[PDB]
Amino acid sequence: MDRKVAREFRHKVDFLIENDAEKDYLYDVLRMYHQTMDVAVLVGDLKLVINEPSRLPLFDAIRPLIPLKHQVEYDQLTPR
């Protein structure tokens, strides 16, 4: 069974980001977030790069990939 969001994720990131280097930055954060398992560091870096309010919507696709319980905490950490 696929995830579905995966497809939309690629399209979203590409549309919002549109950059090659930027895309690698996000992919790197996730790749490390898996082994590191640190939501604190993830949100931090994601902010420095996705700080642009225009990129905020990107967080939507980020949740799906992120663990369930992690999603809840993701919102608890990410302010507004």
Curated annotation (Swiss-Prot):
Signal peptide (UniProt feature, chain positions): none
Domain of life the protein comes from: Eukaryota
UniProt-annotated stretches for the region N-terminal domain: 1-80
UniProt-annotated location(s): Cytoplasm, Cytosol; Cytoplasm, Cytoskeleton; Cell projection, Microvillus
Tissues expressing this chain: Expressed in small intestine, colon, kidney, eye and weakly in pancreas. Expressed also in vestibule of the inner ear.
Disease named in the record: Usher syndrome 1C: USH is a genetically heterogeneous condition characterized by the association of retinitis pigmentosa with sensorineural deafness. Age at onset and differences in auditory and vestibular function distinguish Usher syndrome type 1 (USH1), Usher syndrome type 2 (USH2) and Usher syndrome type 3 (USH3). USH1 is characterized by profound congenital sensorineural deafness, absent vestibular function and prepubertal onset of progressive retinitis pigmentosa leading to blindness. Deafness, autosomal recessive, 18A: A form of non-syndromic sensorineural hearing loss. Sensorineural deafness results from damage to the neural receptors of the inner ear, the nerve pathways to the brain, or the area of the brain that receives sound information.
Record note on quaternary structure: Part of the IMAC/intermicrovillar adhesion complex/intermicrovillar tip-link complex composed of ANKS4B, MYO7B, USH1C, CDHR2 and CDHR5. Part of a complex composed of USH1C, USH1G and MYO7A. Interacts with F-actin. Interacts with USH2A. Interacts with SLC4A7. Interacts (via PDZ1 domain) with the C-terminus of USHBP1. Interacts (via N-terminus and PDZ 2 domain) with CDH23. Interacts with USH1G. Interacts with MYO7B. Interacts with CDHR2 and CDHR5; may mediate their interaction with MYO7B at the microvilli tip. Interacts (via PDZ 1 domain) with ANKS4B. Interacts (via PDZ 1 domain) with DOCK4.
Primary role: Anchoring/scaffolding protein that is a part of the functional network formed by USH1C, USH1G, CDH23 and MYO7A that mediates mechanotransduction in cochlear hair cells. Required for normal development and maintenance of cochlear hair cell bundles. As part of the intermicrovillar adhesion complex/IMAC plays a role in brush border differentiation, controlling microvilli organization and length. Probably plays a central regulatory role in the assembly of the complex, recruiting CDHR2, CDHR5 and MYO7B to the microvilli tips.
Domain notes: The PDZ 1 domain mediates interaction with ANKS4B, DOCK4, USHBP1, USH1G, SLC4A7. The N-terminal region constitutes an independently folded domain that has structural similarity with the CCM2 C-terminus, despite very low sequence similarity.
Protein name as annotated: Harmonin
Organism: Homo sapiens
Gene: USH1C
Full-protein interval shown: 1 to 80 of 552
